Design an enzyme around this catalytic site. Structure first.
Site, mmCIF file in Angstrom:
data_model
loop_
_atom_site.group_PDB
_atom_site.id
_atom_site.type_symbol
_atom_site.label_atom_id
_atom_site.label_comp_id
_atom_site.label_asym_id
_atom_site.label_seq_id
_atom_site.Cartn_x
_atom_site.Cartn_y
_atom_site.Cartn_z
ATOM 1 N N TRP B 131 0.814 -1.209 0.000
ATOM 2 C CA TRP B 131 0.000 0.000 0.000
ATOM 3 C C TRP B 131 0.859 1.276 0.000
ATOM 4 O O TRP B 131 1.567 1.574 0.962
ATOM 5 C CB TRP B 131 -0.951 -0.050 1.187
ATOM 6 C CG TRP B 131 -2.148 0.813 1.074
ATOM 7 C CD1 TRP B 131 -3.087 0.788 0.082
ATOM 8 C CD2 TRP B 131 -2.575 1.798 2.015
ATOM 9 N NE1 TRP B 131 -4.066 1.723 0.342
ATOM 10 C CE2 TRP B 131 -3.777 2.352 1.524
ATOM 11 C CE3 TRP B 131 -2.058 2.267 3.220
ATOM 12 C CZ2 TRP B 131 -4.460 3.366 2.195
ATOM 13 C CZ3 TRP B 131 -2.727 3.273 3.879
ATOM 14 C CH2 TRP B 131 -3.924 3.812 3.369
ATOM 15 N N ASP B 212 -2.292 -4.244 9.676
ATOM 16 C CA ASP B 212 -3.199 -3.462 8.829
ATOM 17 C C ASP B 212 -4.210 -4.498 8.335
ATOM 18 O O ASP B 212 -3.866 -5.409 7.588
ATOM 19 C CB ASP B 212 -2.384 -2.835 7.704
ATOM 20 C CG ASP B 212 -3.232 -2.051 6.709
ATOM 21 O OD1 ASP B 212 -4.398 -2.439 6.485
ATOM 22 O OD2 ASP B 212 -2.707 -1.079 6.128
ATOM 23 N N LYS B 247 -14.009 -1.723 2.943
ATOM 24 C CA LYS B 247 -14.090 -2.930 1.893
ATOM 25 C C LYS B 247 -15.308 -4.004 2.231
ATOM 26 O O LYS B 247 -16.197 -4.298 1.435
ATOM 27 C CB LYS B 247 -12.628 -3.387 1.081
ATOM 28 C CG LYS B 247 -11.970 -2.106 0.715
ATOM 29 C CD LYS B 247 -10.873 -1.799 1.674
ATOM 30 C CE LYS B 247 -10.009 -0.828 0.907
ATOM 31 N NZ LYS B 247 -8.598 -1.112 1.116
#
Lengths: 400, 396
Positions: B131, B212, B247
Site C-alpha cells: 500500500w 493493517d 471494503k
C-alpha cells in the site's frame, strides 16, 4: 527480555469537562441546571436532529447508489456552497478562482489540515489566538509543531473587547505569522469586533504582513448568514492570502458527522491551485478523504430551494431563541433582585458568555443550588429556557 | 506572500489514469485499475444490510451530539471480537482498547502520531511491495519507513527466507507492519505456519507488530482471515491493529475504521490509550458517526449480521470465480505461460506479471487499463468482459 514499547507511558490528565458532566449526572436534585454544555439545546433541553437534516437523510437513503470514495477534497457541490456562504454569491474571489476548498472532518479537522499544510510547506512558526483562548486551538496547532501565542482581547472587569490592548499586543506578531480570528460569535466571550474594528484589523494585517486564519463555526448565530461573514469579507477584499476553517456542526446540528471545510485563498488561481495541491497531500497522509454522510446532507440542503428555506428558518429559530434567552436572563436577574448590570449579555453573540461570576461563586452555585457552569464562569445561554430561568436567576442572585 | 514559493505536489498518476479512462471514447474500454470492489454489473453498490441499518438510524437517532473521542462503544466491542475472537484471553484480561477512526487510513495516522509523541519508535518496516500510502502516513508523523523483502516477482511467490533475513535489520522497538490478510497488492499471504514463525521471531527480536487489516472476510472467511493476527496475539505483550470496514461493508466514503491498542495488562493499555485519545483530540476531535453506527447496528443484530455475512461471502466468492474464469479464459485464448498463481492468491488484487511495456500496449491498443506495476483488480472482471479482456492480454 525486551521492555514493552508502552510500558513507561505516563497517563494523560483526565478530561475535566467529562468530570463535571459526570458530577452533573450524579446530582439527585430535580432542579439541577446544566449551563456547562458545549452544544445548542432547544426549548425542551434537547439537541435534536434538524428537520431539514432528517429530510435530507431520507433523500440520501432513497437515492444513494454507492459509497465509493470521495475525492480528497470531498463533494464538489459542498465546496462551492461553502465558498458562497463565506464570500458571497457574486464574489470577486470566486470569479477570479482565487479560493479552493477541501471538505474536512469538522472544523477541528480543517484546523489540523491547515496546520499540517502550513508546517510542511511554509515558513510559518507561530499562530496568534485571542485571550481567553479556545483550548483546542493550542492542541491542534502544537501537534503540527506550531507555537501558539495569545493576543489581548477580553477585558473581564468591564465585559468588553479591549481593542487598544488587542492592537498593542499584536505589534509583537511578525510578518509571516498567522493571526487567528473567530468569524462571529467569539468563543467563549460572545464579543465580536464591530465592522469598523474588522476593517481596522484587516488594514493592520496587510500592513504588518500577517497571514489571517478565520475560524468560522457559528455562521448565522450572531445576526444572520451574510451579516456574520462581513468581517471575513472585509479581510478578503484586502488580502492576497487567507485561510478559513469552517464548521457545519453548530448551524446544521451535525456535530457527530464531522462536517467542515478548509478554504485557501491566494493572490491568483495559479498560486492557489499550487498551494492546494500540497493541502491535498496533507489530507492524503491523514485520513485520505472525508466522510460523506454529513457533507452530503449539507450539500443536499443548500442546493435545494425548498430544503434550504426550511433549514434557514431553523437556523433563524435557533438564533432568535438564543437572543430571547439573553434578553430574558438580563430581565429576570433585574426582576429577581440582582441590582447589578448584566446588560452586556444582550450585546454578546452566540451560545457562550462569561457571566462575570467568580470561581468561588460558580462552585457555590453547583454545591448549594445545583446550577452548573464551568469554573471560568462561562455559561451556555442555550441551556436556559423559559421554564428554568426563574430558579436559575434566584440562585444567581443568592450568591452575588 | 506565504504561499508564493510553494512547490507543487507531484501529479497523482492514479487519478491521472482514472481521468484518462473517463476521457476514453472507445466503447470496449475496461478498467482493471480500480481500487474498490465491483459486482457483476460493474457497480459498487450499497449493501442491503447497510441500507437496512441506515433506515434503523433514521428512526432511532434523536441527536447528532458528539461521540466520545473513541467513538461508539459497541463499535469498539464488536471490532475487538472480530479481531481476537469472542472469549479471547486478551479481551478477558482487558488488554485491548479501541478508538473508532476515519477509516483504516485514519487509524494508521492516529497510530503514527501516538507512537511519535509517546514512544521511542523511530522506524516502521513495510513489505516490498505494498500500500503506497503507508509511507506518506508514517512520514507525516516523522517516522522513517524501511522496506522488507516479501514478493518474488518471477516465481509469483512469497520469498520467506528473504522476508526473514531482511527483517534481521529491524531493531528491538521498531514497528513491523503486517497485512492481516489479502496482502495488498500481491494477494499472497503467509500460511498459518509462516504466521506462527513470524510471531515467534517477532517476540524474540522485540518488534512491535502493527497489523493493517482492511480485507477481513475476503480471503477465506472472517475467523480464518484473523488467524495470523491471533497467532501474534497468543504470544505478544503489545500489538497495534489498524482496521477498516471500507471494503467488507462497502462503506468506503463514510470513513469507518479503528485503531486498537494491546498492552501487557489493563493498566498499561489504559495509560497508552489515554495518550492515543490526546492524539485524536488534536486531529479531528471525535469520529464520524454514520458509518460506524451502521457497522455496530449490523454486527450487534443477529438478523442484519446474517444478511451482511452472506453479502460478504457473495463478494469473496465472486472474486474467486473471476480469478478462475480469468485463468481458464486465458488458456482458451491460447495465452502461453502459466497464470495458475492467480488462483492461489487472495482478495481483489494480484500482479499480472505483465511488464510495464505490455501494460501501455493494453491501454493504447485495446483500451484495457491496469496500473504500471502490472497490478490488476479482478473485481473489474465480469463474465461479459472476460473474453475481450483476455484476447487483448494474449496479444501482448
Amino acid at each position: 527480555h525486551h521492555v514493552g514499547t508502552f510500558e513507561n507511558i505516563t497517563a494523560a490528565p483526565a478530561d475535566p469537562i467529562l468530570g463535571l458532566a459526570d458530577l452533573f449526572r450524579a446530582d439527585e436534585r430535580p432542579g439541577k441546571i446544566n449551563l456547562g454544555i458545549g452544544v445548542y439545546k432547544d426549548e425542551t433541553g434537547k439537541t435534536p436532529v434538524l428537520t431539514s437534516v432528517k429530510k435530507a437523510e431520507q433523500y440520501l437513503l432513497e437515492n444513494e447508489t454507492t459509497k465509493n470514495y470521495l475525492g480528497i477534497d470531498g463533494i464538489p457541490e459542498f465546496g462551492r456552497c461553502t465558498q458562497e456562504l463565506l464570500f458571497g454569491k457574486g464574489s470577486a474571489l470566486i470569479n477570479d478562482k482565487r479560493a479552493r476548498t477541501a471538505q474536512t472532518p469538522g472544523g477541528t479537522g480543517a484546523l489540523r489540515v491547515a496546520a499540517d499544510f502550513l508546517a510542511k510547506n511554509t515558513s510559518v512558526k507561530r499562530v496568534w489566538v485571542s485571550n481567553p483562548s479556545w483550548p483546542n486551538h493550542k492542541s491542534v496547532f502544537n501537534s503540527a509543531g506550531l507555537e501558539v501565542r495569545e493576543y489581548a482581547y477580553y477585558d473581564a472587569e468591564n465585559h468588553t473587547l479591549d481593542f487598544d490592548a488587542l492592537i498593542n499586543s499584536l505589534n509583537e506578531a511578525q510578518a509571516g505569522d498567522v493571526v487567528l480570528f473567530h468569524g462571529c460569535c467569539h468563543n467563549p466571550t460572545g464579543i465580536d469586533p464591530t465592522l469598523e474594528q474588522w476593517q481596522t484589523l484587516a488594514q493592520l494585517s496587510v500592513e504588518k504582513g500577517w497571514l489571517p486564519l478565520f475560524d468560522f463555526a457559528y455562521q448565522g448565530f450572531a445576526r444572520g448568514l451574510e451579516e456574520d461573514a462581513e468581517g471575513l469579507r472585509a479581510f478578503a477584499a484586502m488580502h492576497k492570502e487567507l485561510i478559513v476553517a469552517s464548521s457545519y456542526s453548530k448551524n446544521f446540528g451535525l456535530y457527530n458527522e464531522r462536517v467542515g471545510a478548509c478554504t485557501l485563498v491566494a493572490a491568483d488561481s495559479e498560486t492557489v491551485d499550487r498551494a492546494f495541491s500540497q493541502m491535498k497531500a496533507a489530507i492524503r497522509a491523514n485520513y485520505s478523504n472525508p466522510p460523506a454522510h454529513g457533507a452530503s446532507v449539507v450539500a443536499t440542503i443548500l442546493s435545494n430551494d425548498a430544503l434550504r428555506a426550511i433549514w434557514e428558518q431553523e437556523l433563524t429559530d435557533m438564533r432568535q431563541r438564543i437572543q430571547r434567552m439573553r434578553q430574558l436572563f438580563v430581565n429576570t436577574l433585574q426582576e429577581k433582585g440582582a441590582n447589578r448590570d448584566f446588560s452586556f449579555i444582550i450585546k454578546q453573540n452566540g451560545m457562550f458568555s462569561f457571566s462575570g461570576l467568580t470561581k468561588e461563586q460558580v462552585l457555590r452555585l453547583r454545591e448549594e443550588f445545583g446550577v452548573y457552569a464551568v469554573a471560568s464562569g462561562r455559561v451556555n445561554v442555550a441551556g436556559m429556557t423559559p421554564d428554568n430561568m426563574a430558579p436559575l436567576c434566584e440562585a444567581i442572585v443568592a450568591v452575588l
